[PDB]
Design a protein around this ligand. Structure first.
Ligand SMILES: OC[C@H]1O[C@@H](O[C@H]2[C@@H](OC[C@H]3O[C@@H](O[C@H]4[C@H](O)[C@@H](O)[C@H](O)O[C@@H]4CO)[C@H](O)[C@@H](O)[C@@H]3O[C@@H]3O[C@H](CO)[C@@H](O)[C@H](O)[C@H]3O)OC[C@@H](O)[C@@H]2O)[C@H](O)[C@@H](O)[C@H]1O
Ligand SMILES: [Ca+2]
Length: 140
């Protein structure tokens, strides 16, 4: 069990109908609040750990938006060292319906240190996710 990682929130700007459910809702510790993106497709969110910081990721936890759990199926989590994710590797792919109102935990087995991590949502999802957490350790 490694510590929860912190960083600068990055990702799709804005929110559905300008209501205010931005990417920041996925990092607030409340499983009742969620990111609702401004478009059906293309939405993503994640962390920049900072210039010169690289973490090895050992675990990811996520909670779907209540009532919209199907919108996570096919979503993937990536690590990268470029902010445009052109060097990204997939750390986990969501293949079954995540349980409602809880954090699903998945192990990651990849020794690479990453400056950036993200959740990349599937078409038709508006990026819907309630909470997103990364765990791991500074790269040696
Ligand atoms: O367009 C973005 C916009 O979507 C808004 O939701 C609309 C959308 O809902 C689809 C979604 O509905 C679930 O159920 C909702 C119901 O639609 C609501 O009216 C009601 O109040 O709550 C229930 C749940 O308690 C389904 O359970 C979801 O699975 C479903 O999502 C889709 O699932 C299919 C597979 O079944 C998948 O292929 C799609 O990709 C996925 O989208 O459409 C119906 C409208 O009534 C909804 O308004 C959403 O509320 C809003 O925040 C914004 O995200
Ligand atoms: Ca939340």
């Amino acid at each position: 069990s490694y510590p929860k990682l912190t960083g600068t929130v990055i990702g799709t700007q804005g929110s559905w109908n300008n209501i205010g459910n931005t990417i920041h809702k996925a990092f607030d510790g409340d499983l009742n609040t969620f990111f609702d993106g401004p478009t059906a497709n293309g939405c993503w969110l994640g962390l920049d750990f900072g210039e010169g910081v690289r973490n090895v990721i050992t675990q990811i936890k996520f909670c779907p938006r209540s009532g919209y759990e199907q919108r996570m199926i096919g979503g993937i989590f990536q690590g990268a060292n470029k902010e445009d994710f052109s060097d990204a590797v997939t750390l986990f792919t969501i293949t079954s319906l995540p349980g409602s109102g809880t954090l699903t935990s998945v192990d990651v087995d990849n020794p690479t240190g990453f400056r950036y991590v993200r959740y990349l949502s599937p078409d038709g999802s508006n990026g819907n996710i309630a909470e997103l957490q990364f765990f791991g350790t500074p790269a040696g």
